[PDB]
């Protein structure tokens, strides 16, 4: 990635990013996981907080994951870029031409209610009051060298909060503040949830590197209504209200 950047590591316990010179642009997953444990004993000097980075360890039980995954695998997996394969329960959108098509959007997966309810329980303010606009499951495999390029998700139809859930196996999220020249690594463990919002959503860029992917990982990705497409917004009548109605619909996957 970027050699000149200052590398940081995330302490889940302290909810801060701690500066590390033992970690680098090409650092291995194992090194980042060990630093995640060894950053918990370091001073707060030079430490930074990325607002909107919320990592919940153990969001889903083995039992809860088993039900969601069996429903996911029965559904077909589509081709995608960068070694990824995808299942998209969302509208078809041309971000450049601001066009939304609801032809392929039938609703949201039946497991959605459980995930949304649990997010509200942990924090109603932080993860509650979420209306699903897109729920996309992404397949990453070490053999296929799957990865996602450093990026900021579109902010026109997708809202402040972006949710990624690590299924089957965990990974590391690399976050880049190009202007501030800061690189941070967030280790998302198995059955964990990440919400990227606020500074993380707009100021920082998010990507999953190939060397940080082991075995097969499925990202259950969720997106929320942009305020413009929501009630009290310009596009609600043209596009948002239908999208809320379709998102309220649940596709039966059990079966
Ligand atoms: Cl799979
Ligand atoms: Cl992503
Ligand atoms: Mn993204």
Set out the fold topology.
Elements: E1 6-11, E2 16-19, H1 29-38, E3 53-56, H2 62-74, E4 78-79, E5 85-89, E6 92-94, E7 99-101, E8 108-109, H3 112-122, H4 124-127, E9 132-141, E10 148-151, E11 158-167, E12 171-177, E13 182-188, E14 193-196, H5 199-202, E15 205-208, E16 216-225, H6 236-248, E17 250-251
Parallel strand pairs: 1-13, 8-17
Antiparallel strand pairs: 1-2, 3-14, 4-5, 5-9, 6-7, 9-16, 10-15, 11-14, 11-16, 12-13, 12-15
The structure holds chloride ion (CL) (2 copies) and manganese (II) ion.
The site of one chloride ion has 3 residues, from loops.
Domain Fe2OG dioxygenase: 52-223
Subunit structure: Interacts with top-2; the interaction is required for localization of top-2 to DNA. Also interacts with mtss-1, his-24, ule-3, C18B2.3, pgl-1, ceh-93, mcm-4 and F37C4.5.
Catalytic activity: an N(6)-methyl-2'-deoxyadenosine in DNA + 2-oxoglutarate + O2 = a 2'-deoxyadenosine in DNA + formaldehyde + succinate + CO2
Task: Give a concise summary.
It is found in: Nucleus. The protein is about 20% helix and about 35% strand.
């Amino acid at each position: 990635k970027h050699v000149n950047y200052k590398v940081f590591i995330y302490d889940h316990i302290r909810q801060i990013a701690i500066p590390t010179t033992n970690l680098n642009s090409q650092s291995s997953l194992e090194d980042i996981i060990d630093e995640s444990t060894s950053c918990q004993s370091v001073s707060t000097d030079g430490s930074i907080e990325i607002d909107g980075l919320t990592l919940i360890h153990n969001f889903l039980s083995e039992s809860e994951e088993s039900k969601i995954l069996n429903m996911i695998d029965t559904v077909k997996w589509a081709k995608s870029k960068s070694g990824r394969r995808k299942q998209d329960y969302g509208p078809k959108v041309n971000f450049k031409h601001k066009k939304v098509k609801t032809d392929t959007f039938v609703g949201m997966p039946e497991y959605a209610d459980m995930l949304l309810n649990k997010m509200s329980e942990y924090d109603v303010k932080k993860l509650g009051n979420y209306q699903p606009f897109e729920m996309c499951n992404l397949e990453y495999e070490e053999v296929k060298k799957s990865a996602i390029e450093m990026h900021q998700d579109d902010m026109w139809i997708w809202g402040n909060r972006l949710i990624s859930i690590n299924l089957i196996n965990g990974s590391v999220m690399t976050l880049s503040n190009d202007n501030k020249s800061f690189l941070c690594y967030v280790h998302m463990p198995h059955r964990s949830l990440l919400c990227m919002a606020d500074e993380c959503r707009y100021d920082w860029k998010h990507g999953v590197l190939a060397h940080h992917i082991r075995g097969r990982r499925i990202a259950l990705t969720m997106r929320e209504a942009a305020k413009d497409f929501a009630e009290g917004g310009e596009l609600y009548e043209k596009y948002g209200a239908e999208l809320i109605r379709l998102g309220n619909i649940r596709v039966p996957l059990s079966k």
